[PDB]
UniProtKB/Swiss-Prot annotation, chain A:
UniProt EC number: 1.1.1.35
Gene Ontology, cellular component aspect: mitochondrial matrix; mitochondrion
Catalytic activity, reaction form: a (3S)-3-hydroxyacyl-CoA + NAD(+) = a 3-oxoacyl-CoA + NADH + H(+)
Swiss-Prot/TrEMBL GO biological process terms: fatty acid beta-oxidation
UniProt lineage: Eukaryota, Metazoa, Ecdysozoa, Nematoda, Chromadorea
UniProt-recorded name of the protein: Probable 3-hydroxyacyl-CoA dehydrogenase F54C8.1
Quaternary structure and partners: Homodimer.
Gene Ontology molecular-function annotations: 3-hydroxyacyl-CoA dehydrogenase activity; NAD+ binding
PANTHER family (UniProt xref): 3-HYDROXYACYL-COA DEHYDROGENASE F54C8.1-RELATED (PTHR43561:SF2), PTHR43561
Family: Belongs to the 3-hydroxyacyl-CoA dehydrogenase family.
From Swiss-Prot, chain B:
Entries under PANTHER family matching the protein: 3-HYDROXYACYL-COA DEHYDROGENASE F54C8.1-RELATED (PTHR43561:SF2), PTHR43561
Superkingdom of origin: Eukaryota
Annotated keywords: Fatty acid metabolism, Lipid metabolism, Mitochondrion, NAD, Oxidoreductase
Name this polypeptide is given: Probable 3-hydroxyacyl-CoA dehydrogenase F54C8.1
Pathway membership: Lipid metabolism; fatty acid beta-oxidation
Any GO CC annotation of this UniProt entry: mitochondrial matrix
Organism: Caenorhabditis elegans
InterPro entries with a match to the protein in the record: 3-OHacyl-CoA_DH (IPR022694), 3-OHacyl-CoA_DH_CS (IPR006180), 3-OHacyl-CoA_DH_NAD-bd (IPR006176), 3HC_DH_C (IPR006108), 6-PGluconate_DH-like_C_sf (IPR008927), 6PGD_dom2 (IPR013328), Mito_3-hydroxyacyl-CoA_DH (IPR052242), NAD(P)-bd_dom_sf (IPR036291)
Catalytic reaction annotation: a (3S)-3-hydroxyacyl-CoA + NAD(+) = a 3-oxoacyl-CoA + NADH + H(+)
Entry's family note: Belongs to the 3-hydroxyacyl-CoA dehydrogenase family.
Localization per record: Mitochondrion matrix
Amino acid sequence: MFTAKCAMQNIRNVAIVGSGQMGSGIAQVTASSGFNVMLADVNKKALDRAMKAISQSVTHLSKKQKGTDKEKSDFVTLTMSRIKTCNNVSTAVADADLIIEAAIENIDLKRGIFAQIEQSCKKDSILTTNTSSFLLEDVAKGLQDKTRFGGLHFFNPVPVMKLLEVIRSDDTSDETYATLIKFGTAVGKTTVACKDSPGFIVNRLLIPYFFEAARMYERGDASMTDIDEAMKLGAGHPMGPFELADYIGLDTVKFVMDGWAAKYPEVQLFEASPLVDKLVAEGKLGRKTGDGFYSY
Amino acid sequence: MFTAKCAMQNIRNVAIVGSGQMGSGIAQVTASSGFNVMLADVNKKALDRAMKAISQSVTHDFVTLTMSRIKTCNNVSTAVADADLIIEAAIENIDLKRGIFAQIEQSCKKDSILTTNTSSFLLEDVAKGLQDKTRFGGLHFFNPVPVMKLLEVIRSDDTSDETYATLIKFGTAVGKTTVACKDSPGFIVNRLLIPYFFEAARMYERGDASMTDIDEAMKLGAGHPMGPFELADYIGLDTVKFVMDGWAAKYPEVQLFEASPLVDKLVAEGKLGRKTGDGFYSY
């Protein structure tokens, strides 16, 4: 983490635009790792919600440490003082060296956010998205300097999940990409490198594998519970595909696979699943609603 | 295991035709679980190497006793004459298997259940020649059979309810966790895993990401104990290729089954994975 941090003298102040679960988790690990954080969202209620969740989580971790009760709360306040909030994007990004967008998955809203960002940030600022749902080319399409754009695809809960996929568009410069690799490593992650291809690595291989399982079930070849057992037991996976999809969220999996089906209409693997569609249309989204493939 | 074994009063004698690695491993766990076994192959040398490998595993009276339950026979007709269950583990050639089953049919008891362990063909293609298709099914084990707990128990369109119930009990009697599948290409495991591995190869081939970053992403992102290139090397590249080739030829309109250059090259070059010290990676 230090080898990386000390090789990015240029990157001291980070702005995260969007204050939901991912934005708040990215803010937490960025602060814990020693950078200054500005978390931005026009939604004040969301900003308050995030800072309470971060504060909780940081406090929680400190409790595991060895040390005096002062040593611990000292640790929490050092971390939290690196995090500031702002309800105006242009103000928030004015002194940022790296900006990470974690907003709603809507391409016009994101492009609008990036136009605001580039109007206000520093000339050599690096801009990034955490999206799972769009190509970096399509997010960056209006920017003046595409060579300082890339992707930082974390996984929820960000403080717990080690992996980080670091993405380059066709236009990302080598220097910007290398900086992004060092930032992922500085914040404690195991980075993997991917081009701007739908699904990067994890989702591109996992979501179609899940849909293939659903498809097997829908043809009537085997039951959901036998599928899951065969994969845990035959391949060592800790969750079968249906449990996995419930865990990720059905709405989450459908929405990604829907964007692929539409952009890549000739690719058989990306067809929607009558059954996924019907479960999401019913609000049976998986664990987070208590009910998807299975009940919880 | 006992709950199963004592509900199969009719199944005492098991014949296994083909004494390669899977037939020999099925012989071993079937002997260990209390059945009588006849191991049959027309290649006397193979039969010899199979009994030496088996005794080698089982050592690791108990060795003598376990062995006394396994007899060999280089004649498939006479080997199955007294068998209640016959399990075919022969080479992956459909004419050879149909000829074997033509032989077994002519000799076996009329109530005998007939099964294949094949990964490469549809049950209904293996059985296409058979007069009573209703006592036919699939017992798909995994190498090494003595260690691998899963067994996919497969029915055709013709397998009777009674035959299939017996097959599930057999799997359970021999210490396996059974799962049921219809006669579909790849059953459950290979149908999901082999295309996920090819998807991984294709991603590397397109130049999107490196082999080691793809494997690291799947271990860390999904908790998989091996990433897809590690797993393929473990299973064997020749094995993964041969099954996928079968699918690409039989289902020519399915994009997911299209062959891979890197794979073809690595197998055409004899780089078959862990078992040869080189596949995707070196060992």
